[PDB]
């Protein structure tokens, strides 16, 4: 069971980028929030 | 003469006004950029943000036309901007004895007497900025006014001015009134005493004074008095490699989060440029384990302060820390690249800081911009193509309305960094000799604390150094020599502003000629002129130029 | 014997690099999948 | 002026007094006083909190009864040490944290004596472990709202660290009051004596855990673990099939073996290894 | 030069040793 762990973690690779949510849609989320606060 | 020799070489005055002579002749700036940033008129940070920008891009050039275009928009903000507006006047007049008292004759505290004492009390802050590493009457003129004055509103600018001029001098006379400034049991004297108390004892390790400081910051109930001493006990020890390690363990073990954080700055200064494996174990172990966010940001920002001697290794370790769960380590990963590779146009560091301006936390978008500013000063499009890719990027985020005030605070500050002195001055924590430039090391560490005091990071003019070759043949006479270059000619580019309402590689140069340090090898020696340099031309600065 | 003394150290040191560097790349990517679980 | 780095130091005892009084009388908005030690222009320190009783049925902040506080202010004065009232609090039950129009008026009566009384909101429901829902506030003058002037004159990068919620931004933030960043005053005099005293198992692991039934429970799992392995003798057999991203959506109706089958193995190990080891330490120690 | 070929190459074994010890801290610290 250790060797099936020790010979298993090699194909973890090219996990390229954990994207948080956005740049644009985050800003659109902020603009939509500012609209509700004004309302 | 040889009798005059000790004045010529140890006062160093003929480097001071000559650097002033280089700046009064070479001045390539723009009014339109401040007019582009003029349109953000509101009651936000912006008034302080504009006056800190032009003071950065006009260091020591004595050019008061970017401030004297108006009075009301300059005197709109109040109560600490007027402390900073009278502060920024001295940085523009950096390194110049005469036009300090005579221009601030309006701003002497006993002449006008307005409703603002910060306007008149903050002048002494700027007097220390002019005569940094120059001790004369500027010691005693600032000494005697601090015997009898107001409360800690003139006493900030006086004490921060007085410790700056007497930096690393171990004067007893500056230590006398800094004792009674310390024991006021007062919060507002906290930045006043504890910062300058370390400055005059730089590298001194006078262990009674250490015992006075750390013995005082255990029972006091204010925080600025815990914070000004936090940098000062880090600054009293400087480059010792083993002689602080009893104190470093004594501070790291303590329950105080400020004082553990202060021990992180102390091991940063006891290992300046030191590639020691012993320091990096537990400096970066407490970057893993500790629970306060302040100490974790100070931990990862100690990496470039100890490993700037080899800028190749710091992108290999701090790239992994730029993806941490908390934004605090994600912040201090960015300035760690900003303090290490800043003298280089590092291709790898800009590759790391490219998605760092995308993070939904505001202040990590801030510090990504400052580190992007420090990495590429005096670099035009050929050291790395990402220069003009980012020139538009600061304008992209400062002309937006829906951005944060903090996120666009990095953009307005990067304008004064990236165009400093008309591309005539630069940062250098490093001489060609291998020896580090200790006022720039102090000046960049003190610059990090713009969180906890805004004009505390006005202490940045110590980091600015020119890059100009200078010829000389007698004690006074300028020569007349004109040499050229050999490598590709577009590297000698200028900013070339836009102002909207068949090639060289034989570039002739006068005596005060600016040059990139990477362009020191691409030039040609003067072989056909009357002058022939006795020194092998490897560094800039001033040299003897033998007339043949 | 600088061929047979000094160059005998370049041949040895590279052997310690070529597996302890592989130890890191396995281990940091093992955290990198774990770090993806935390922030998400 | 203020430098928006106001840094309210509180306590360790008061937060427990805040949540207990906020939880036992929960759906009515309860309130009390803040008896702290006032310090400089920058910070404020509130170390003690005593709760004030209500007036009647109904969610309100009704009024303070100065008969009660004046006798209470000199109650512990003759016993312990003098302090001074540095603020006051109430409790939104399941809202969040804001100043309502009823909340702002009893605040405005308290800022008249001292200009630094802190309005504190605690929420004892949206708090689980690393959340204690807080963010005390304090009023801003509406005179400066007509001037269009932005207050609090930021001199440090310490204020704009926390982001306000949008629901509090619907309310008078930021047009009538402001947030204040806080931390907590912890000390070893309290830290160790609550860690080493909360969950201490006495002699539990020196037992045998119902010795006829442990091996009986060692079959109460294994028997259905057979058929749960028959599902594992089933679900692997319909692979090399429709692209197992489709085997993620489609398996939300009925149970899977693979996760459920590594579940009991953890259960059938720690129930056995702990019980088998503890049997073999009793044989040595007890004769 | 040849003398720098070993002195700079032992210089990074100094530098490599922390990193595997460093991620060893974070295999357990993120779990907590
Ligand atoms: Zn309420």
Curated annotation (Swiss-Prot), chain A:
Biased composition annotated in UniProt, kind: Basic and acidic residues: 15-39
Domain of life (superkingdom): Eukaryota
Record region (Disordered): 14-39
Subunit details: Component of the 19S proteasome regulatory particle complex. The 26S proteasome consists of a 20S core particle (CP) and two 19S regulatory subunits (RP). The regulatory particle is made of a lid composed of 9 subunits including PSMD3, a base containing 6 ATPases and few additional components. Interacts with UBQLN1 (via ubiquitin-like domain). Interacts with ERCC6.
Family, similarity comment: Belongs to the proteasome subunit S3 family.
Purpose of the protein: Component of the 26S proteasome, a multiprotein complex involved in the ATP-dependent degradation of ubiquitinated proteins. This complex plays a key role in the maintenance of protein homeostasis by removing misfolded or damaged proteins, which could impair cellular functions, and by removing proteins whose functions are no longer required. Therefore, the proteasome participates in numerous cellular processes, including cell cycle progression, apoptosis, or DNA damage repair.
Designated name of the protein: 26S proteasome non-ATPase regulatory subunit 3
Gene: PSMD3
Range within the parent protein: 487 to 525 of 534
From Swiss-Prot, chain B:
Keywords: Acetylation, Phosphoprotein, Proteasome, Repeat
GO annotations of cellular component type: azurophil granule lumen; cytosol; extracellular region; membrane; nucleoplasm; nucleus; proteasome accessory complex; proteasome complex
MF terms in GO: enzyme regulator activity; ubiquitin protein ligase binding
Residue(s) carrying N6-acetyllysine: 401
Superkingdom as given in the UniProt entry: Eukaryota
PC repeat segments: 84-117, 122-155, 157-191, 192-226, 228-261, 262-297, 298-330, 332-366, 367-407, 410-442
A GO BP entry: proteasome-mediated ubiquitin-dependent protein catabolic process
UniProt KW Repeat keyword: yes
Function statement: Component of the 26S proteasome, a multiprotein complex involved in the ATP-dependent degradation of ubiquitinated proteins. This complex plays a key role in the maintenance of protein homeostasis by removing misfolded or damaged proteins, which could impair cellular functions, and by removing proteins whose functions are no longer required. Therefore, the proteasome participates in numerous cellular processes, including cell cycle progression, apoptosis, or DNA damage repair.
Similarity comment text for this entry: Belongs to the proteasome subunit S1 family.
Protein name, UniProt field: 26S proteasome non-ATPase regulatory subunit 1
Native organism: Homo sapiens (Human)
Lineage: Eukaryota, Metazoa, Chordata, Craniata, Vertebrata
Gene name of the record: PSMD1
Whole sequence portion shown: 320 to 917 of 953
From Swiss-Prot, chain C:
Protein family per UniProt: Belongs to the AAA ATPase family.
Protein's UniProt name: 26S proteasome regulatory subunit 8
Disulphides: none
Protein task: Component of the 26S proteasome, a multiprotein complex involved in the ATP-dependent degradation of ubiquitinated proteins. This complex plays a key role in the maintenance of protein homeostasis by removing misfolded or damaged proteins, which could impair cellular functions, and by removing proteins whose functions are no longer required. Therefore, the proteasome participates in numerous cellular processes, including cell cycle progression, apoptosis, or DNA damage repair.
Annotated localization: Cytoplasm; Nucleus
Segment of the intact protein contained: 19 to 58 of 406
Transmembrane segments: none
Domain of life where this protein originates: Eukaryota
Quaternary structure (record): Component of the 19S proteasome regulatory particle complex. The 26S proteasome consists of a 20S core particle (CP) and two 19S regulatory subunits (RP). The regulatory particle is made of a lid composed of 9 subunits, a base containing 6 ATPases including PSMC5 and few additional components. Component of a complex with USP49 and RUVBL1. Interacts with PRPF19. Interacts with TRIM5. Interacts with NDC80. Interacts with PAAF1. Interacts, in vitro, with the thyroid hormone receptor (in a thyroid hormone T3-dependent manner) and with retinoid X receptor (RXR). Interacts with ERCC6.
Swiss-Prot record, chain E:
Superkingdom to which the source organism belongs: Eukaryota
Compartment list: Cytoplasm; Nucleus
Quaternary assembly: Component of the 19S proteasome regulatory particle complex. The 26S proteasome consists of a 20S core particle (CP) and two 19S regulatory subunits (RP). The regulatory particle is made of a lid composed of 9 subunits, a base containing 6 ATPases including PSMC4 and few additional components. Interacts with NR1I3. Interacts with PAAF1. Interacts with TRIM5. Interacts with ZFAND1.
Protein's job: Component of the 26S proteasome, a multiprotein complex involved in the ATP-dependent degradation of ubiquitinated proteins. This complex plays a key role in the maintenance of protein homeostasis by removing misfolded or damaged proteins, which could impair cellular functions, and by removing proteins whose functions are no longer required. Therefore, the proteasome participates in numerous cellular processes, including cell cycle progression, apoptosis, or DNA damage repair.
Family from the record: Belongs to the AAA ATPase family.
Name of the protein: 26S proteasome regulatory subunit 6B
Organism: Homo sapiens
Residues of the full protein shown: 39 to 70 of 418
């Amino acid at each position: 069971h250790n060797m099936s762990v020790k010979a298993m973690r090699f194909p973890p690779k090219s996990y390229n980028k954990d994207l948080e949510s956005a740049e644009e849609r985050r800003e659109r989320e902020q603009q939509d929030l500012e609209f509700a606060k004004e309302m | 003469d040889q009798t005059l020799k000790m004045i010529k070489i140890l006062s160093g005055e003929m480097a001071i006004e000559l650097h002033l002579q280089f700046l009064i002749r070479n001045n390539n700036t723009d009014l339109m950029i401040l007019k582009n940033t003029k349109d953000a008129v509101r009651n936000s940070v912006c008034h302080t943000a504009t006056v800190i920008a032009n003071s950065f891009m006009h260091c020591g050039t004595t050019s008061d036309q970017f401030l004297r275009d108006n009075l009301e928009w300059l005197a709109r903000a109040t109560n600490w901007a007027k402390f900073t507006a009278t502060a920024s006047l001295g940085v523009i007049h950096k390194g110049h004895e005469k036009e300090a008292l005579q221009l601030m004759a309006t701003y002497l505290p006993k002449d006008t007497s307005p409703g603002s004492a910060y306007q008149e009390g903050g002048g002494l802050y700027a007097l220390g900025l002019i005569h940094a590493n120059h001790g004369g009457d500027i010691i005693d003129y600032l000494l005697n006014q601090l015997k009898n004055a107001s409360n800690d509103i003139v006493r900030h600018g006086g004490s921060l001015g007085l410790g700056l001029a007497a930096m690393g001098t171990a004067r007893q006379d500056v230590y006398d009134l800094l004792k009674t400034n310390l024991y006021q049991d007062d919060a507002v004297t906290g930045e006043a005493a504890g910062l300058a108390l370390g400055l005059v004892m730089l590298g001194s390790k006078n262990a009674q004074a250490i015992e006075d400081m750390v013995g005082y910051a255990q029972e006091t109930q204010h925080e600025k008095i815990l914070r000004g001493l936090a940098v000062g006990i880090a600054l009293v020890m400087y480059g010792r490699m083993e002689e602080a390690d009893a104190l470093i363990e004594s501070l790291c073990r303590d329950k105080d989060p400020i004082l553990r954080r202060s021990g992180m700055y102390t091991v940063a200064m006891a290992y300046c440029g030191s590639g020691n494996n012993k320091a990096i174990r537990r400096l970066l172990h407490v970057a893993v384990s500790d629970v306060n966010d302040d100490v974790r940001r100070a931990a990862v920002e100690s990496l470039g302060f100890i490993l700037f001697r080899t800028p190749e290794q710091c992108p290999s370790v701090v790239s992994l820390l730029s993806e941490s769960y908390n934004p605090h380590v994600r912040y201090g990963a960015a300035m760690a690249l900003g303090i290490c590779c800043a003298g280089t146009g590092n291709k790898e560091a800009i590759n790391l800081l490219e998605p760092m301006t995308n993070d939904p936390v505001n202040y990590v978008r801030q510090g990504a911009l400052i580190a992007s500013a420090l990495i590429m000063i005096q670099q035009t499009e050929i050291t790395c193509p990402k220069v003009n890719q980012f020139r538009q990027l600061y304008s992209k985020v400062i002309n937006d309305k829906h951005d944060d005030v903090m996120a666009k605070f990095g953009a307005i500050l990067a304008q004064g960094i990236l165009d400093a002195g008309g591309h005539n001055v630069t940062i250098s924590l490093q001489s060609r000799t291998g020896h580090t430039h200790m006022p720039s090391v102090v000046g960049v560490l003190v610059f990090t604390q713009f969180w906890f005091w805004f004009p505390l990071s006005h202490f940045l003019s110590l980091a600015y150094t020119p890059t100009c070759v200078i010829g000389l043949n007698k004690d006074l006479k300028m020569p007349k020599v004109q040499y050229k270059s050999n490598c590709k000619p577009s590297t000698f580019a200028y900013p070339a502003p836009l102002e909207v309402p068949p090639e060289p590689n034989f570039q002739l140069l006068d005596n005060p000629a600016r040059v990139m340090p990477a362009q020191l090898k691409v030039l040609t020696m003067p072989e056909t002129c009357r002058y022939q340099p006795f020194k092998p031309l490897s560094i800039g600065g001033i040299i003897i130029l033998k007339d043949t | 014997g600088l061929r047979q003394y000094y160059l005998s150290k370049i041949e040895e040191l590279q052997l310690i690099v070529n597996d302890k560097s592989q130890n890191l790349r396995r281990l940091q990517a093992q955290r990198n999948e774990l770090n993806a679980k935390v922030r998400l | 002026a203020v430098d928006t780095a106001e840094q309210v130091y509180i306590s360790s005892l008061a937060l427990l007094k805040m949540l207990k009084h906020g939880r036992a009388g929960v759906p009515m908005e309860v309130m009390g006083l803040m008896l702290g030690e006032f310090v400089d222009d920058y910070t404020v320190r509130v170390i003690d909190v005593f709760a004030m009783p209500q007036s009647g049925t109904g969610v309100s902040v009704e009024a303070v009864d100065p008969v009660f506080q004046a006798k209470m202010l000199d109650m512990l004065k003759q016993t312990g040490r003098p302090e001074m009232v540095v603020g006051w609090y109430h409790s939104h039950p399941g809202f969040g944290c804001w100043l309502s129009g009823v909340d702002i008026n009893t605040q405005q009566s308290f800022e008249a004596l001292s200009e630094r009384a802190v309005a504190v909101v605690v929420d004892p429901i949206q708090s689980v472990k690393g959340k204690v829902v807080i963010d005390a506030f304090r009023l801003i003058n509406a005179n400066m709202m007509v001037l269009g002037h932005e207050p609090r004159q930021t001199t440090s990068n310490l204020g704009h660290l926390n982001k306000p919620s949008i629901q509090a931004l619907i309310h008078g933030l930021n047009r009538h009051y402001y947030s204040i960043t806080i931390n907590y005053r912890k000390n070893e005099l309290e830290q160790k004596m609550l860690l080493n005293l909360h969950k201490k198992s006495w002699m539990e692991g020196l037992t045998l855990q119902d010795y006829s039934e442990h091996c009986k429970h060692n079959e109460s799992v294994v028997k259905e673990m057979l058929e749960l392995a028959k599902n594992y003798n089933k679900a692997v057999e319909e692979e090399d099939k429709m692209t197992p991203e489709q085997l993620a959506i489609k398996n939300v109706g009925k149970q899977d073996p693979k996760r459920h089958l590594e579940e009991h193995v953890d259960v059938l190990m720690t129930s056995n290894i702990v019980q088998c080891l503890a049997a073999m330490l009793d044989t040595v120690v007890f004769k | 030069d040849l003398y720098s070929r070993y002195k700079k190459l032992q210089q990074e074994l100094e530098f490599l040793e922390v990193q595997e010890e460093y991620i060893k801290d974070e295999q357990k610290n993120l779990k907590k």
